[PDB]
Symmetry: D2
Subunit: 477 residues, 4 copies
């Protein structure tokens, strides 16, 4: 019997009284593991209202006390890490080891964010007026909402709530209807440690219903959403009605540039890891490789073996695999279609390229060759273990092609040449550029994508300041 | 014969070939002073494309060289200050002295922004990985657009372009169709000093046409618009289609709090100045006064005389007036209606309250009494010399009422009590709080409004950073 | 039998082989509680050399790993807090409750400093040269030394070592020969948790011997010393020989200004607390009070009762006292002499003013009246529970007199008037100004005294940066 | 007839009444060009007192107004640039072109520093106490003194006074007795533009007399001195008596590392330029070269020709030379001795190595080979056009040897390898590291040397903050 999850509103779990439910299916077995309410905008309003009530008294607390609350939550996470991990594996369909780190990192991330308590600073600005003091304070926005993705559902709860709460905001989070269980568990921890009512709220439902309310409710100061570009378009358009601030993370088509002088083994590992992780279902995954011709042959051959070596299976039954299934049937069909589009445009399927037909949504690691920069596969985000490769002559070309995208979240380049590195740094129009290593953001970095990849960012000091606004005081006395 | 202005695109003035024109009328005499093209989206695209072409080579220039270009423009402004001022007075209908400062301040503002060249810093972040360097660079967004207002048309050209160009962005500006002449003059200066083609572009037309293109063109990194809330809604909604970043300044209903222990003379002057300036046509104008009961009588009487003393006339024919006419007929009718709405709701018209019937759009300073916090006049932005006054008992009430608004740009309070001041600072949910002085932002402050007052901000370091984005480089080597 | 303490050098406790020892006497009972080696410069060199060897590999560790080491130490402190407290009480002669907070705060302070790991930032500066990158890195100084005081011996170990180690420096600490036991205990914890050898070293001895070496050894990057002005003079003079950086905290004569409109009860409590704490043996203690005439009478009377109510005794035998004995006989005699000097100059002894004759070094709370600004008692730091009071007319006078000092560490003022506050803030030439509260620095503040009070500072971000230096890299490639 | 210069004290030039004078001799012709007073400590006190009187009212001025004063001075410099240049050439003995840039850069430097007016920020720190505000203000130190060097006498006036005055400090400057004329000219400009009396003061005399007073006068907040290490030792030791803050720039032995993969032509030019500039009389001059063996031969040969091509002469009579004479006879003899010491230790004199015997103090460019790392010539600063070269095997060795010095101001390395660069950056313990370019600091960088090279620094934001201190306000209200 799959559990029927309640939403968490105003400091308590509230059982759903509606008739409609959303089935949460295991992407590996297609079994229904649980059901969440097919929430309505009304449910989002209640949470938003509770969030609004709590905000004043929450921001009035000294920052160190808000931090203290965050630490109780992280400690709560660690005590149930294995259990949380298992939930991620089940509904997310990600490999055990990855679920384990997500959970562990989430707790550390929260603890790290809590350390900002006594550190985000306001400023005292010199005035041209004698006897005047210009004090610029950093204040909370108020009520914030978070629309989470399914690829890293647990971490993203923290990615948004930790910085939000620390700075004195309250939040109403909507997890992805595909992966709500880990969120329910996060709520249980929040409830158990007694976090003040209304500071953290979890509503459940679809994006067109619950999500939209979290972006269109006039009481919301900022809606932080992570999802598809089109979804971000719908979210920002809605947030526009009330001039609501948006913080968007909409994916990418992260290019990887391999120079002739690249540490070939290093590059192949970084790229494969960066591409095969979570079955390529990450916004900063290496989605397109540019290999300089001089090294194309040996590199593509090495890259080919590596990927062909990537094993995939049911994460709950194997800990020797690198990939689990894709999130759902639609996702699988989406990947198959894009690969077909690639073939149709003239691309060559080295290995893989055919979705497994059977229980679950598995897609084999895929290497696409004879790809031309103009091919859709090089522009549209795949979100699957598919890797197209294009050869280039000069750095200028690689840079030019890497920049030829509506996405600008992550980029990577492997070289040992100083000038090439500096030129790539300067030329690459991306929010992130990894040099001689895999695409894994640090919690103290700034994961903010250029162009359509998003607006605003997450992590680090700047992620923290996304939840802070200013009050310039002109004191004359 | 009114001059037919050409747009400034890709380093040159381009004569309009369309048949439709927009008349630019003098708000004081209703005479047509000039005509601008009824530009189309196509015209905005050409400018945007030119802006895109120039951007790479513009950002490649050392910051100090971009600054050098800004200084040539400011110097250009000063050489023609009187002429520019006259244009502002004519089309803007603002008093000579105010036009003079706008022009003078604009030049200083540009020079000030240019000084950021060698100062906006990137960051070197500690990494948890041995041998890794985390370099966070500040980069330009690329192509930015600016939709300017008519109240301070000249300054706002600089408010957006100076920080934009300094940081390496290129810009396409659309002035308000009501006040384009000063913008044309700004373009002439830009053209005369030889600013690289495509870095600064001026397109002319309506907001639903030209404005929309500047917000919806996919090549635009960020659209910076200053106008009405509803206009901001339309702009952000459009910018949403391409996940374009928005920087919005949409007005306010700036509350002014007068405590019993306030320097009465100081408060009356600050508020009147802050309210009557530009005929109350400023977003940070004192739009609603809260006077503690103990001082209500003497204060309201003093305030009454002050405002009644405010003279208004045709700015081109008098330099002894404090106000000019409102921007246009619609604006006038809007103010009359809101005052009527006030009366209808129970408000009392002390003095003024009746638009002059005749050539021009003049509205007398107006004091509204017997106002209740729930009255529309206390929520809807007036943008006219109308001043409603509400009495209150405690600070808590004044704060509560001040915060009771969809606008949160500016706020002010007059007191001599430490605790009252600190409590007001902490309690006031505004981007700006003036204490014992008039509402005039410093160029080194941060004019960023809360709630519907806007998104992002202008001026100072933070205004400058609105035009900067980040590139986090994870260097391993 | 008093324990003979060994020094802690290069990761291990080393037994003293010399013949001379320093007796550590209980300031309350005059009993010998322990003995430490009468260390020689040679002993300081060994520690410095070990510190130098370890530095490279210590700074090579990721900051988060150094932080991890700090946290092990703080956790170690907490597990033995009661025991550490008891040692402080015994050798320091401070009241149990104060020893308890010192220990508790020390651990929190260390944990707080460890949180800077991923936060101290370098900077990327814009260059006037095309293709150039200016990278300003923050690096450790190298080997640093710390000469600790006896008033807050335990906390100061952390005040210097935590920020030092986090930033990648190694340190050689010399506790005060009067209070080394708590330091030995800190070393035991460091040793037990396995902190890399040479990173933390504890040498024992006198200042003219061991202390001098820690300031004059050419391998020392910076000597951080907290003590008497004359001692600081000797330390800086020595550090001069090798152009060694100094961070000095040399005490103060913290003035307290009470305005007529001050919350009298609040002021009396703040001042007494700030003065009687640790028997007035703190650099930021209220050492001189300026009371506006209008409130002089009632205030001085209230202040008098409060102080007369302050009980003092043997901290190990009573937890109902506010003060313990002074550090030693010399200290006691110093206070008696200064009070006598006060009387001789014309001062009036309200209450107290006579050192108890007997076992221990107790001095009663003392209130001095009929004091003139020029009296020595108003300039020379007392470091005893003696409180001189001077009446003044205007704020200007209070400010002027407060500033009339070679010390400029801490200052305080009690008022409810905005202007008085702002004028005091602006006029007071001090590193710290408390307004309507007692003089207790926050760990996130910046305890850095002006004038002779010191050079550099402690605590917060700026305290942390005292242990960091810069490396500006001009990269052309 | 050589002019007898007066000192500039308290807003006016004061004629010397003493009997003793110091002859200012032209290093190229040995002719007496002028005479300055053999000032006494008393003269320094008068200036310091005037500086103290003016300080309060100077700091009370809005920062932008202080900046305005700086700009008047820079503009004054430019109007007399040629004349100032000529003076530098005459007394400094530097080539016309270098004197010209010094003057031009000085003016730009001052203008740049003035731009900090509205930019140095204080901070608002979060407190653990409810209702408390922690405001950290940046205040001036008060009275500061500057002991200038003779190598870049004009620039250093600005390097110290510009940041000092902008932040609200007043200053008393002592130029080098060898090069006071340019300082007198700077004073004339200051006097002509009407800078408030006492804000800028110029005293003349020797270091043991006037200099010492500027470091030992108890009214001095900070003494900023640039000179020899031993002089810095005497200055800091003196400043110690009153716990006066010191900012010292004491020279260097800047190492240059040439890797096998270095752009040989680029490296030879950078190093020669960096070494031959001002006849090698600069603290950041390349003073020792480390060439990897693989490229040693071709590099040393190229380097040899380059240096042999460096022409030197009387700067007033030739504009085709790269070097002028050394500052004075003692300097010349010092260089000859050090070269002899090199030869005696086993070094080989490729070319030059023999001071010209005749009118003036000329020393030919000198290349020393067969140098061993332990040779004095590789440790003692030469301050002459002498260049020792050592061969090395690995980067590790070059780094190790570069770090083997009491000086740590500047360092440089030429390579095209990413890892080598990053390793050099990380390994080089210097305040500056130039990569593939000559050693010329940017005004927005931070010229602060490690180890004995100095304490504190100059230029940029951090140079500016050397003249700023903090006042942490704990506001409770
Ligand atoms: C086709 C059935 C499923 C439905 C049926 O009973 O017919 C079986 C037979 C082949 C099976 C696959 C074999 C390769 C993989 C082994 C992994 O360790 C788990 C996932 C995969 C992808 C398996 C998934 C599923 O277990 C399949 C597809
Ligand atoms: C009504 C005519 C205009 C049209 C006509 O010819 O009838 C005149 C008569 C009264 C005039 C007003 C008198 C008061 C004001 C004097 C100011 O110095 C200019 C603006 C005002 C508000 C004038 C505007 C205009 O000049 C009016 C309104
Ligand atoms: C109306 C008189 C002027 C005419 C007269 O002499 O009566 C006064 C009253 C209020 C004055 C304004 C106050 C705010 C501004 C102060 C600026 O530093 C200069 C421009 C402004 C905009 C002033 C312009 C002018 O000085 C006004 C409008
Ligand atoms: C004088 C003897 C000590 C020596 C002797 O045996 O004569 C006794 C008698 C009076 C004693 C004091 C009484 C007042 C205090 C009581 C406190 O709870 C502990 C400290 C004090 C200050 C005591 C210290 C010491 O215990 C004294 C001074
Ligand atoms: C030796 C006399 C000077 C004294 C005398 O009359 O004997 C002359 C003869 C050789 C002369 C030198 C020749 C080479 C250089 C030519 C430069 O353009 C100026 C500096 C030098 C270094 C000259 C300096 C001086 O002019 C010298 C040394």
């Amino acid at each position: 019997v799959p559990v029927q999850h309640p939403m968490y509103i105003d400091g308590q779990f509230v059982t759903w009284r509606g008739d409609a439910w959303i089935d949460v299916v295991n992407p590996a077995t297609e079994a229904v593991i649980s059901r969440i309410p097919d929430g309505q905008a009304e449910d989002a309003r209640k949470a938003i209202d509770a969030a609004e009530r709590a905000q004043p008294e929450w921001e009035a607390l000294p920052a160190i006390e808000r931090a203290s609350w965050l630490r109780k939550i992280s400690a709560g996470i660690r005590e149930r890490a294995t259990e949380i991990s298992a939930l991620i594996v089940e509904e997310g369909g990600k490999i055990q080891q990855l679920a384990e780190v997500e959970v562990a990192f989430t707790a550390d991330y929260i603890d790290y964010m809590a350390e900002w308590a006594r550190r985000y600073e306001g400023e005292i600005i010199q005035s041209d007026r004698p006897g005047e003091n210009i004090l610029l304070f950093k204040r909370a926005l108020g009520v914030t909402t978070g629309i989470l993705p399914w690829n890293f559902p647990f971490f993203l709860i923290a990615r948004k709530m930790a910085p939000a709460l620390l700075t004195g905001n309250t939040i109403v989070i909507k997890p992805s209807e595909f992966t709500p269980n880990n969120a329910i568990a996060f709520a249980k921890i929040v409830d158990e440690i007694g976090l003040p009512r209304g500071v953290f709220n979890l509503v459940l439902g679809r994006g067109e219903t619950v999500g939209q309310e979290l972006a269109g409710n006039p009481k919301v100061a900022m809606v932080s959403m992570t999802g598809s570009v089109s979804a971000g378009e719908k979210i920002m358009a809605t947030a526009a009605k009330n001039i609501t601030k948006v913080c968007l993370e909409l994916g990418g088509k992260a290019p990887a540039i391999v120079m002739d002088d690249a540490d070939l083994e290093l590059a192949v590992k970084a790229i494969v890891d960066s591409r095969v992780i979570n079955s390529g279902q990450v916004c900063n995954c290496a989605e397109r490789v540019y290999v300089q011709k001089g090294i194309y042959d040996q590199f593509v051959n090495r890259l080919g073996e590596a990927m062909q070596a990537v094993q995939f299976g049911n994460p709950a039954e194997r800990n020797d695999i690198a990939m689990g299934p894709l999130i759902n049937a639609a996702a699988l069909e989406r990947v198959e279609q894009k690969v077909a589009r690639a073939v149709e445009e003239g691309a060559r399927v080295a290995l893989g390229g055919k979705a497994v037909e059977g229980k679950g949504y598995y897609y084999p690691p895929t290497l696409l060759l004879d790809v031309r920069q103009e091919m859709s596969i090089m522009h549209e985000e795949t979100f699957g273990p598919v890797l197209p490769v294009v050869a280039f002559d000069t750095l200028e070309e690689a840079i030019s092609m890497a920049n030829d995208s509506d996405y600008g979240l992550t980029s990577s380049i492997y070289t040992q040449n100083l000038n090439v590195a500096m030129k790539a740094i300067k030329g690459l129009k991306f929010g992130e550029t990894y040099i001689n290593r895999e695409n894994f953001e640090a919690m103290q970095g700034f994961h903010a994508g250029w162009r359509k990849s998003g607006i605003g960012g997450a992590d680090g000091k700047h992620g923290l300041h996304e939840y802070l606004q200013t009050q310039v005081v002109y004191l004359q006395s």
